Amino acid sequence: REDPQLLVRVRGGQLRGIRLKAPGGPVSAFLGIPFAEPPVGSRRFMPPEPKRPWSGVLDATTFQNVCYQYVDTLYPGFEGTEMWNPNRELSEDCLYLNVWTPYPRPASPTPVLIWIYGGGFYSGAASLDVYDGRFLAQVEGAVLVSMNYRVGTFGFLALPGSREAPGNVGLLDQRLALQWVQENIAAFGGDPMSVTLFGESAGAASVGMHILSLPSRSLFHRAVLQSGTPNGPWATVSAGEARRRATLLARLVGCPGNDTELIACLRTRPAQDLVDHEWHVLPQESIFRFSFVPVVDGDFLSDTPEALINTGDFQDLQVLVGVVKDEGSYFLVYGVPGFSKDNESLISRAQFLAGVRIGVPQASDLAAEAVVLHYTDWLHPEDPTHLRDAMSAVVGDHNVVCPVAQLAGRLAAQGARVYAYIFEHRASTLTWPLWMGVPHGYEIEFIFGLPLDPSLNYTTEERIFAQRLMKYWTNFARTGDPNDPRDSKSPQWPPYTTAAQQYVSLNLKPLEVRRGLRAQTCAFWNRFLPKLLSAT
Amino acid sequence: EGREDPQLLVRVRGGQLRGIRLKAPGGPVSAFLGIPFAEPPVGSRRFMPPEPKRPWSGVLDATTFQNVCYQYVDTLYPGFEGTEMWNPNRELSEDCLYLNVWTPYPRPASPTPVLIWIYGGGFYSGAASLDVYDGRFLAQVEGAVLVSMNYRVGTFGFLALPGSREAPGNVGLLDQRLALQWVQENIAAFGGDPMSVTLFGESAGAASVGMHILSLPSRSLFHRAVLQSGTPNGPWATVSAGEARRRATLLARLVGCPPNDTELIACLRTRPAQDLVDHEWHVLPQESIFRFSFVPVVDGDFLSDTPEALINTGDFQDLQVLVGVVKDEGSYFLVYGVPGFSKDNESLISRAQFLAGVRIGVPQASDLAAEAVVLHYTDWLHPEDPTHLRDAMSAVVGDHNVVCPVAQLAGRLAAQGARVYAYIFEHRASTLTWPLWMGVPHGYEIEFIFGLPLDPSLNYTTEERIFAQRLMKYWTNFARTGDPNDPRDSKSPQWPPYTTAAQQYVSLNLKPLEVRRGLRAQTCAFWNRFLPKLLSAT
């Protein structure tokens, strides 16, 4: 006897989901729904094609394969790195999506939240424990969707102008999943007329690229960009740079000269051979730089995100944007000498100068000197704790905080309704050292509501805090406003404007309104540093 | 002699002098005013180094101030005390090389530490005869022997054709040096100790003090130094030989002296003094503020290298220095040449007026350097706020010309063995006639250090009188011991030495001493470390 709540018919055919247990009650989950033809063989590097219809009842009770990617080996056995590693088998046959809905299915159309994971466009999976949509579905009545999209060479290797490897195919995988939601989410009780995209890091940069790409704009109504932006120094490469990186990668794997022959030879290569050389194509020694990322193709991205955010009309848009307290701290242990998760990472002045060259790899000698002079505390210029913290701030400000301030400002000046935040709470369970503070991605578990599971050992304060964040995010998805039409005791979260520059602190204390998101420092990155590059 | 006050008759190397008994609030003082220390630098002697005054016959009357060195007079605000207190108060003349001595009455029984005052006025103005430089309070209250000299200013003191014999440059600094040599030889006759000489000066006077620290022949003439709101390093105190040559050549063309250095200088010597003064402001390379036409030149003689190079390589182990700044160094300079600024209104300016002001205030800045300044000083939370823009403009001028050259000097001196004490003076005189927005302008600490509030007729508050006494004590304890702290008063907060490690300085105001750290540390790293690199590369 089948559960009729677990039986759904979508355009491709019948699906069978699973009844999952959330702390407050059951939820319906439809996991591993195919949204595209497997992008394998001749389809490697090609745009996704819609999944052909299937016969019978497709089993949607388990997560599907993770898109082929590099697996972190930096610290084996360690939860801090391993919680981000694939938790299902790696395969190029990975274009599946997941749906969580209340149990029983909503009676009236419910706002939809679509999650786009991060992982520097080279990693990630919609199946990670921290992206579990059951708490939002059960507590807030949300319809949550998450898709896998191609990463690394598979999703972003490009030979711009070619038909066989046009670039941005991982973003086209995301778009195809958004199209799938428009066409099929009503069958799950979701409202296709109320779709909110939310993502973190490369997922937030992806959300921003859907805001900037006109064919995606009819597929969603609101957006959340957590610790990532389409503008900035890592999220995109020029066509010339993508071409150089693809050509070098092909040379490294013995390929093959026309694009057709090069791409055909790359298609014969085992997936692990491409992954084995993907990190060898970066132009300089660097951190917070990824080999295969979205390309300014003149197609998905008609111009650079910088040009599109300056000239765009965003009147019809509501956006929630923010950062964590220590955006850059993870990136330091990965490639800056003197940094380690196993010690306090107290560094010398020489190590700070060398770190700035790795952290700002495009910087000339004069630009790197300007960074060092701005971030040095001239009262304590040799203090190792100050230097360690300044190094973390350089990386986080350059890559995330100042591109976010730039984006928030441009969106607000061009008609968008913008809400901004800083997330400052460090999870009690965090296994990374205290010096790393709140690293990138450690807000996600709170927004998804993992502290609501009593077996995960978060504090009572953390459980109450997670409930407050779930409410801000779902109130934003429902209304374009994170404010509750009920709690007059907590201060209101004001929209971010170019005039007042208001943002809120998200921590265990009630919301606090602050003005100017690193205003002086971000004028250095956003206004001065470009001028120092343009004239040199 | 016979019927005169026997306490006022003194002999010096050049001959006999008769001084005057002056009244200070607490009692009498001896003053020997208008003592000639050089041959009048007139006629063929114009632009030439000073020659020592030849001996005179009879008793020279030293009872009144002598002539002020020929200079530009500010007539912008008729009757305004704010400008007029700095204007000449005696006849303008090229015959101006005289000095003044104040001592206790009767003269000290044992050798007393000497304080030598060098006035400021951008190397184009000033006089040792101004009321704010009155040595009688320090002589009476502290028992000090105070000396002040007139030195040539403008073209007369600083016009140079480097390499020429007739106009070698720095002759105004040589006038100061000749007065220091005069003190070494003659001050014992007044009860002064030639083995305990402290130089103190403000603004161009402080820059002059710094140049005596950096010029070896002056080093044997003093033991300690006070630099108030001025330094030898920085953007206004010196010019290169090439720049001095360009300015002198242009001035000569402007007065009808055309093209050989001998002929040019000989023609400049035939010109009336007022003709040179009338054209001296026309030779500046750009529209600017805090820039003076005729200043010390890096000649390879008085200054063997640039002050920047000499402060970086110098050994200052044997030296004790007191250095500091006022709260609003740049505010006066804005009313003089920045559009939108006035002493008669609040001077609330627009962003456009701030950018134009930065070009005038940092005249050497390229487009990129000027934008770095604007971006650093803008409050990005209120980028168009007129009060912040007005205050940022004042801070740009003050930091670039005084605060950051002072921090640079204090750091180099301390790292190279000197004992340094640093301060910020934050008290605005209750009597001040400049508007409140101008805060504490440059030079408005001088009247407190000289002890003018001790005179009940000047209308300072009781707190100001107590504050002046405290400052007079810091300055004279520094002159006596190389330490401004009183050893028999450990109850009062101590003034710690400035070091590269702790960067400690004190606030001088009506409240007891407060110790602060980092003299505008972040902002001065911008001016002292970044901006030179922005010039050196682009």
Ligand SMILES: *[C@@H]1O[C@H](CO[C@@H]2O[C@@H](C)[C@@H](O)[C@@H](O)[C@@H]2O)[C@@H](O[C@@H]2O[C@H](CO)[C@@H](O)[C@H](O)[C@H]2NC(C)=O)[C@H](O)[C@H]1NC(C)=O
């Ligand atoms: C403050 O005054 C200045 C100077 O103006 C003069 O002095 C005034 C007190 C009054 O007597 C005026 O009639 C005088 O002209 C003003 O600065 C000028 O502003 C204009 C327009 O912005 C500009 O084109 C000029 O170059 C400026 N001139 C100078 C000498 O600065 C200023 O506008 C006044 N500010 C305020 C807030 O009223």
Ligand SMILES: [N-]=[N+]=NCCNc1c2c(nc3ccccc13)CCCC2
């Ligand atoms: N860039 N890349 N990062 C991959 C490393 N894995 C991590 C991810 C995130 N946060 C991390 C924090 C610490 C360590 C690894 C992390 C957030 C987005 C998902 C990927």
Ligand SMILES: [N-]=[N+]=NCCNc1c2c(nc3ccccc13)CCCC2
């Ligand atoms: N530079 N120059 N300034 C000449 C104008 N006179 C003034 C002086 C000083 N302070 C002033 C403050 C306000 C107005 C004129 C001033 C201190 C040094 C002596 C000269």
Ligand SMILES: *[C@@H]1O[C@H](CO)[C@@H](O)[C@H](O)[C@H]1NC(C)=O
């Ligand atoms: C921290 O650990 C790394 C490990 O390679 C080491 O290089 C660094 O010197 C250590 N720092 C301290 C302060 O011990």
Ligand SMILES: *[C@@H]1O[C@H](CO)[C@@H](O)[C@H](O)[C@H]1NC(C)=O
């Ligand atoms: C929670 O703590 C208990 C020990 O009290 C431990 O057995 C359990 O595994 C912890 N849970 C997690 C998710 O770490």
Ligand SMILES: *[C@@H]1O[C@H](CO)[C@@H](O)[C@H](O)[C@H]1NC(C)=O
């Ligand atoms: C001092 O105050 C009196 C009024 O009590 C006034 O007439 C005089 O002009 C003032 N003098 C000074 C120097 O301010």
Ligand SMILES: [Cl-]
């Ligand atoms: Cl780069």
